[PDB]
Design a protein around this nucleic acid. Structure first.
Length: 105
DNA sequence: GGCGACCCGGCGCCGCCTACGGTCAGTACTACGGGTAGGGGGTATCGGGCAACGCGGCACTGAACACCGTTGTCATGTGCCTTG
Protein backbone atom coordinates (compact mmCIF):
# COMPACT_ATOMS: atom_id res chain seq x y z
CA UNK A 1 0.00 0.00 0.00
CA UNK A 2 3.03 2.25 0.43
CA UNK A 3 3.91 2.07 -3.24
CA UNK A 4 4.67 5.36 -5.04
CA UNK A 5 1.32 5.18 -6.92
CA UNK A 6 3.42 6.16 -9.91
CA UNK A 7 4.04 9.54 -8.33
CA UNK A 8 7.42 10.55 -6.98
CA UNK A 9 5.95 12.56 -4.13
CA UNK A 10 2.70 13.23 -2.22
CA UNK A 11 1.04 9.92 -3.11
CA UNK A 12 0.51 6.38 -1.89
CA UNK A 13 -1.50 3.50 -3.31
CA UNK A 14 -2.76 3.14 0.27
CA UNK A 15 -4.75 6.39 -0.02
CA UNK A 16 -6.81 5.66 -3.14
CA UNK A 17 -9.05 2.69 -2.19
CA UNK A 18 -12.19 3.27 -0.14
CA UNK A 19 -13.09 0.91 2.69
CA UNK A 20 -16.42 -0.82 3.32
CA UNK A 21 -16.71 -1.19 7.11
CA UNK A 22 -17.46 2.52 7.52
CA UNK A 23 -21.12 3.26 8.21
CA UNK A 24 -22.68 5.50 5.57
CA UNK A 25 -24.54 8.22 7.53
CA UNK A 26 -27.23 8.38 4.82
CA UNK A 27 -28.13 4.70 5.12
CA UNK A 28 -27.91 4.81 8.92
CA UNK A 29 -30.31 7.73 9.29
CA UNK A 30 -32.67 6.24 6.71
CA UNK A 31 -32.72 3.05 8.78
CA UNK A 32 -33.39 5.06 11.95
CA UNK A 33 -36.33 6.81 10.29
CA UNK A 34 -37.59 3.43 9.07
CA UNK A 35 -37.42 2.08 12.62
CA UNK A 36 -39.28 5.08 14.03
CA UNK A 37 -42.00 5.02 11.37
CA UNK A 38 -42.51 1.26 11.75
CA UNK A 39 -42.70 1.60 15.53
CA UNK A 40 -45.25 4.39 15.10
CA UNK A 41 -47.48 2.36 12.77
CA UNK A 42 -47.02 -0.58 15.13
CA UNK A 43 -48.27 1.54 18.04
CA UNK A 44 -51.19 2.66 15.87
CA UNK A 45 -52.52 -0.90 16.01
CA UNK A 46 -53.75 -2.49 19.23
CA UNK A 47 -51.15 -2.82 21.97
CA UNK A 48 -51.65 -6.59 22.20
CA UNK A 49 -51.32 -7.07 18.43
CA UNK A 50 -48.33 -4.74 18.61
CA UNK A 51 -46.61 -6.78 21.30
CA UNK A 52 -47.17 -10.17 19.72
CA UNK A 53 -45.91 -9.06 16.29
CA UNK A 54 -42.91 -7.40 17.95
CA UNK A 55 -41.94 -10.56 19.82
CA UNK A 56 -42.54 -12.80 16.80
CA UNK A 57 -40.35 -10.73 14.46
CA UNK A 58 -37.92 -9.70 17.20
CA UNK A 59 -38.20 -5.91 16.93
CA UNK A 60 -36.58 -5.41 20.37
CA UNK A 61 -33.91 -8.14 20.19
CA UNK A 62 -31.83 -9.29 17.25
CA UNK A 63 -33.06 -12.89 17.17
CA UNK A 64 -36.76 -13.49 16.39
CA UNK A 65 -38.82 -15.89 18.48
CA UNK A 66 -40.79 -18.87 17.20
CA UNK A 67 -44.57 -19.08 17.46
CA UNK A 68 -44.71 -21.41 20.46
CA UNK A 69 -41.71 -19.52 21.85
CA UNK A 70 -44.09 -16.59 22.31
CA UNK A 71 -46.66 -18.81 24.05
CA UNK A 72 -44.65 -19.01 27.28
CA UNK A 73 -44.17 -15.42 28.46
CA UNK A 74 -47.62 -14.43 27.18
CA UNK A 75 -49.17 -17.78 28.15
CA UNK A 76 -50.98 -18.50 24.88
CA UNK A 77 -51.14 -21.42 22.47
CA UNK A 78 -48.93 -22.13 19.47
CA UNK A 79 -52.02 -21.82 17.22
CA UNK A 80 -53.53 -18.75 18.89
CA UNK A 81 -50.24 -16.92 18.34
CA UNK A 82 -50.29 -18.01 14.69
CA UNK A 83 -53.84 -16.74 14.26
CA UNK A 84 -53.16 -13.29 15.69
CA UNK A 85 -49.97 -13.09 13.64
CA UNK A 86 -51.97 -13.92 10.51
CA UNK A 87 -54.60 -11.25 11.15
CA UNK A 88 -51.84 -8.76 11.97
CA UNK A 89 -50.28 -9.47 8.58
CA UNK A 90 -53.73 -9.05 7.05
CA UNK A 91 -54.24 -5.65 8.67
CA UNK A 92 -50.74 -4.36 7.93
CA UNK A 93 -51.30 -5.58 4.37
CA UNK A 94 -54.18 -3.09 4.23
CA UNK A 95 -53.19 -0.11 2.03
CA UNK A 96 -53.81 2.21 5.00
CA UNK A 97 -50.75 1.18 7.05
CA UNK A 98 -48.58 0.42 4.01
CA UNK A 99 -47.94 3.73 2.24
CA UNK A 100 -45.59 5.11 4.90
CA UNK A 101 -43.70 1.80 4.65
CA UNK A 102 -43.79 1.53 0.84
CA UNK A 103 -40.79 3.77 0.16
CA UNK A 104 -38.78 2.06 2.90
CA UNK A 105 -39.13 -1.43 1.38
C1' DG B 1 47.17 18.87 26.40
C1' DG B 2 43.90 21.53 25.12
C1' DC B 3 43.12 23.84 21.13
C1' DG B 4 42.43 23.76 16.54
C1' DA B 5 41.37 22.52 12.18
C1' DC B 6 39.28 19.59 9.49
C1' DC B 7 36.98 16.09 8.62
C1' DC B 8 33.64 13.74 8.75
C1' DG B 9 29.26 12.29 10.06
C1' DG B 10 24.91 13.38 10.40
C1' DC B 11 20.87 15.16 10.03
C1' DG B 12 17.69 18.01 8.24
C1' DC B 13 15.26 20.76 5.10
C1' DC B 14 14.06 22.42 0.51
C1' DG B 15 6.25 25.87 -0.37
C1' DC B 16 0.41 25.32 -0.69
C1' DC B 17 -3.77 23.21 -2.84
C1' DT B 18 -5.66 20.90 -7.70
C1' DA B 19 -6.88 16.95 -12.91
C1' DC B 20 -5.74 12.78 -14.70
C1' DG B 21 -1.68 7.79 -14.19
C1' DG B 22 -0.06 2.02 -16.53
C1' DT B 23 1.58 -1.69 -15.65
C1' DC B 24 5.36 -7.33 -14.54
C1' DA B 25 10.26 -10.19 -13.12
C1' DG B 26 14.52 -16.18 -14.21
C1' DT B 27 17.59 -22.85 -10.78
C1' DA B 28 14.25 -29.80 -7.20
C1' DC B 29 12.11 -33.92 -6.29
C1' DT B 30 9.65 -37.77 -4.54
C1' DA B 31 7.48 -40.15 -0.97
C1' DC B 32 4.95 -41.37 2.85
C1' DG B 33 1.74 -40.67 6.35
C1' DG B 34 -1.83 -39.01 9.10
C1' DG B 35 -5.69 -36.81 9.37
C1' DT B 36 -9.21 -34.35 8.00
C1' DA B 37 -13.61 -31.47 6.19
C1' DG B 38 -16.48 -32.91 3.04
C1' DG B 39 -19.58 -36.69 0.86
C1' DG B 40 -23.20 -39.58 2.15
C1' DG B 41 -28.70 -41.69 6.02
C1' DG B 42 -31.17 -42.01 9.60
C1' DT B 43 -33.33 -40.06 13.82
C1' DA B 44 -35.24 -36.91 17.49
C1' DT B 45 -37.34 -32.57 18.22
C1' DC B 46 -39.71 -28.43 17.21
C1' DG B 47 -43.23 -25.76 14.12
C1' DG B 48 -47.53 -25.50 10.95
C1' DG B 49 -53.03 -26.17 9.26
C1' DC B 50 -58.56 -27.61 10.93
C1' DA B 51 -61.58 -27.17 14.76
C1' DA B 52 -61.62 -26.66 19.60
C1' DC B 53 -64.68 -24.75 23.66
C1' DG B 54 -65.85 -21.11 25.59
C1' DC B 55 -69.05 -16.78 26.56
C1' DG B 56 -73.35 -13.04 26.53
C1' DG B 57 -77.35 -11.06 25.04
C1' DC B 58 -81.31 -12.14 24.92
C1' DA B 59 -84.64 -15.11 24.31
C1' DC B 60 -87.56 -18.56 24.67
C1' DT B 61 -90.45 -24.02 27.34
C1' DG B 62 -93.55 -20.03 28.85
C1' DA B 63 -94.21 -21.70 34.15
C1' DA B 64 -95.53 -19.86 37.90
C1' DC B 65 -97.02 -16.86 39.91
C1' DA B 66 -98.61 -11.68 40.99
C1' DC B 67 -101.71 -7.03 39.62
C1' DC B 68 -105.39 -4.87 38.68
C1' DG B 69 -110.02 -5.60 36.37
C1' DT B 70 -114.23 -7.53 36.39
C1' DT B 71 -119.71 -9.45 36.95
C1' DG B 72 -119.65 -13.62 40.16
C1' DT B 73 -122.50 -13.90 44.76
C1' DC B 74 -125.27 -12.83 48.06
C1' DA B 75 -127.68 -12.62 53.25
C1' DT B 76 -129.43 -8.87 53.91
C1' DG B 77 -131.63 -4.21 53.61
C1' DT B 78 -136.01 -0.22 51.31
C1' DG B 79 -140.91 0.21 49.37
C1' DC B 80 -145.59 -1.24 48.54
C1' DC B 81 -149.71 -4.11 49.92
C1' DT B 82 -152.60 -6.61 53.16
C1' DT B 83 -154.36 -7.20 57.71
C1' DG B 84 -154.28 -5.93 62.83
Amino acid sequence: LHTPLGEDGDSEFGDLIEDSEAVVPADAVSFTLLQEQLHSVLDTLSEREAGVVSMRFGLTDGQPKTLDEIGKVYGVTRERIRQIESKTMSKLRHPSRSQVLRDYL
